[PDB]
């Protein structure tokens, strides 16, 4: 994952969810995974 | 406060009740009746409970 | 919309609510479940399952579509039971039964044996094809996830366990 306080979607099919009380970006491309930290 | 809660009232509305009923007994003697004569303290709660307004949460 | 559909009974020989508790039986075995007490589960004209709720809360609309499919995985979990079809890819990789267990040759210095738990049947149809079968959708899906992660994801050659017809991603290599 990428760990930054500013996460946001990169491509068309990145999705921004909130699991376990943290904002993260799940995507099919593995280098687009991000979570806030 | 301990003797009033035996007679299912708080200290709070007991002091409102005795001011409303015109009972000028001070707290020195009201805590002395509560020990030596618990029946007369029950007779003072019923005077305080009756003089209390019907809805205490309603404005004056 | 899910929750806004009454659950039918295909066969369901004992589809009976016993006090915030639902059971099931059909051709295959039995299952149990307990729905959370704000959500109400009821009956259709022919005894089929109906799910209701108190209306318009954040926490009640979510548990309503939740407990709908969890009931309809019992009336479907018995009759039309759940199988996952799994395929071994990679040169030299194979799988065999040793009893009800399931041994793998995945390029290690030892065979990896998967003990089949209760209510789970393993069966092969080929040396690189097999199925995980059972009645409970979660318990079948948990075992098929354990067998899936037996090797590291390889983008370069694609060797290892997969699900059937899934498209793993590939990298260009050297």
């Amino acid at each position: 994952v990428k760990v930054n306080p500013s996460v946001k979607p990169i491509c068309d099919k990145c999705r921004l969810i909130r699991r376990h009380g943290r904002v993260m970006v799940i995507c099919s491309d593995p280098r687009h995974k991000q979570r806030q930290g | 406060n301990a003797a009033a809660r035996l007679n299912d009232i708080t200290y709070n509305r007991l002091i409102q009740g005795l001011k409303a009923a015109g009972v000028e007994v001070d707290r020195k003697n009201l805590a002395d009746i509560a020990i030596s004569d618990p029946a007369a303290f029950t007779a003072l709660v019923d005077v305080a409970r009756a003089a209390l307004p019907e809805d205490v949460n309603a404005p004056s | 919309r899910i929750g806004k559909q009454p659950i039918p009974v295909p066969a369901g020989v004992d589809v009976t609510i016993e006090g915030q508790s639902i059971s099931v039986k059909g051709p295959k075995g039995t299952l149990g479940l307990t729905v959370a007490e704000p959500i109400k589960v009821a009956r259709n004209d022919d005894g089929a399952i109906v799910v209701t709720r108190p209306d318009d809360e954040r926490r009640n609309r979510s548990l309503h579509g939740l407990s709908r499919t969890l009931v309809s995985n019992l009336v479907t979990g018995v009759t039309q039971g759940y199988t996952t079809k799994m395929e071994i890819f990679g040169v030299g990789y194979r799988v065999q039964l040793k009893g009800s267990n399931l041994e793998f040759a995945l390029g290690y210095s030892h065979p990896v044996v998967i003990e089949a738990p209760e209510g789970i049947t393993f069966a092969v149809q080929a040396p690189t094809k097999f199925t995980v079968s059972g009645i409970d959708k979660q318990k079948v899906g948990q075992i098929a996830a354990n067998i899936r992660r037996l090797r590291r994801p390889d983008p370069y050659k694609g060797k290892g366990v997969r699900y059937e017809g899934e498209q793993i991603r590939r990298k260009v290599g050297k």
Partner: protein, 146 residues
């Protein structure tokens, strides 16, 4: 002169408190008020008045699900790095009577006389207590309406 209790005036009784669906805070307050004697009109702050309190079913007490996970219990041994911690949830597995007892002792005054007050407290994890030689009357949480 106002009433001061002599030696030989206090009458101590026995109470049992069922702890099945009571939150830990409400029970520890009602046990501490009952061990000290705040409900008797002969209360004096220098006198061990108050009654014997038995707390049964201490494993059942209403603790929140996130308090069992995250609330901590710290102990230090005097040695460097002696800070040993558990959670509430894993103390309820081992010693659920010690969780109920620790909540009551933090609500008592911090003096010598509270050390003789806490000797009248018995906490048991199960529904059964050995003090049937006395007759503990059951105690329920009452709130005098206002």
């Amino acid at each position: 002169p106002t009433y001061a209790p002599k030696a030989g005036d206090t009458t101590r009784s026995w109470y049992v408190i069922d702890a099945t669906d009571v939150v830990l805070g409400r029970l520890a307050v009602a046990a501490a008020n009952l061990l000290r004697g705040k409900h008797k009109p002969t209360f004096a702050p220098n006198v061990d008045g108050g009654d014997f309190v038995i707390v049964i079913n201490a494993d059942k007490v209403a603790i929140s699900g996130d308090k069992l996970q995250h609330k901590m219990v710290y102990r230090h041994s005097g040695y460097p790095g002696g800070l040993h911690k558990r959670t509430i949830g894993e103390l309820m597995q081992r010693h659920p009577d010690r969780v109920v007892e620790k909540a009551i002792l933090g609500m008592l005054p911090k003096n010598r006389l509270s050390r003789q007050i806490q000797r009248k407290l018995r906490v048991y994890a199960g529904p059964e207590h050995p003090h049937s030689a006395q007759q503990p009357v059951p105690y329920e949480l009452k709130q005098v309406a206002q």
